[PDB]
């Protein structure tokens, strides 16, 4: 019954797609869907229309959206499969958070850069340490693969 909750979370994104966030029925399955999360606002990777593919295995009520970057992206919360450590999806999730919600929050990892939660052994490091790795590269990917 998860997909039918995703009916809002995912499809509410399709009901009214503003900016830096859009998903919806891709395979027409609510477990294989494509969200375009963007640098566009004030972001280290501004310009970067990133790509998130999300899948669900019959989760609801508790629907943990494994929302994963299709592309490459340097940031402590994104490990090398695009899978994000996002509080509202790991700690603060409830059946009241649309992807219409989470997409902006994930956008906020490109937009808001949080210096807190380390998911990846290195990528968390290169973020809060190898300032080069985080900005230059993920913004370069922004230029190359996203934009």
Swiss-Prot record:
In the record, the note on similarity to other proteins reads: Belongs to the ubiquitin-conjugating enzyme family.
Q: Which reaction does it catalyse?
A: S-ubiquitinyl-[E1 ubiquitin-activating enzyme]-L-cysteine + [E2 ubiquitin-conjugating enzyme]-L-cysteine = [E1 ubiquitin-activating enzyme]-L-cysteine + S-ubiquitinyl-[E2 ubiquitin-conjugating enzyme]-L-cysteine; S-ubiquitinyl-[E1 ubiquitin-activating enzyme]-L-cysteine + [acceptor protein]-L-lysine = [E1 ubiquitin-activating enzyme]-L-cysteine + N(6)-monoubiquitinyl-[acceptor protein]-L-lysine
Cited PROSITE patterns: UBC_1, UBC_2
UniProt pathway: Protein modification; protein ubiquitination
Q: Give the record's GO biological process terms.
A: protein autoubiquitination; protein K48-linked ubiquitination; protein modification process; protein polyubiquitination; protein ubiquitination; ubiquitin-dependent protein catabolic process
Molecular function in Gene Ontology: ATP binding; ubiquitin conjugating enzyme activity; ubiquitin protein ligase activity; ubiquitin-protein transferase activity
Quote the CDD domains the UniProt record gives.
UBCc_UBE2D (cd23792)
Q: What is its EC number?
A: 2.3.2.23, 2.3.2.24
Q: Locate the active site.
A: 85
Question: Which residue stretches, if any, does this entry annotate as coiled coil?
Answer: none
Its GO CC terms are: cytosol; extracellular exosome; nucleoplasm; nucleus; protein-containing complex
Residues in UBC core domain copies: 1-147
What function does this protein fulfil? Answer: Accepts ubiquitin from the E1 complex and catalyzes its covalent attachment to other proteins. Catalyzes 'Lys-48'-linked polyubiquitination. Mediates the selective degradation of short-lived and abnormal proteins. Functions in the E6/E6-AP-induced ubiquitination of p53/TP53. Mediates ubiquitination of PEX5 and SQSTM1 and autoubiquitination of STUB1 and TRAF6.
What keywords appear on the UniProt entry? ATP-binding, Nucleotide-binding, Transferase, Ubl conjugation pathway
Gene that produces this protein: UBE2D2
- What happens after mutating residue 64 to A? Abolishes histone H3 ubiquitination and decreases interaction with PHF7
Q: How does it assemble?
A: Interacts with SCF (SKP1-CUL1-F-box protein) E3 ubiquitin ligase complex. Interacts with CNOT4 (via RING domain). Interacts with E3 ubiquitin-protein ligases CBLC, PJA1 and PJA2. Interacts with PDZRN3. Interacts with PPP1R11. Interacts with E3 ubiquitin-protein ligase PHF7; the interaction inhibits cleavage of PHF7 and promotes association of the complex with the nucleosome core particle.
Q: Name one Pfam family in it.
A: UQ_con
Q: Which SMART domains would you find in this protein's record?
A: UBCc (SM00212)
- NAD: present as a keyword of the record? no
Q: Which domain of life is it from?
A: Eukaryota
Result, substituting residue 144 to E: Abolishes histone H3 ubiquitination
Which InterPro entries does the entry link to? UBQ-conjugat_E2_core, UBQ-conjugating_AS, UBQ-conjugating_enzyme/RWD
Q: What is the effect of changing residue 90 to A?
A: Abolishes histone H3 ubiquitination and decreases interaction with PHF7
Which species does the entry assign this protein to?
Homo sapiens
User: What is this protein called in UniProt?
Assistant: Ubiquitin-conjugating enzyme E2 D2
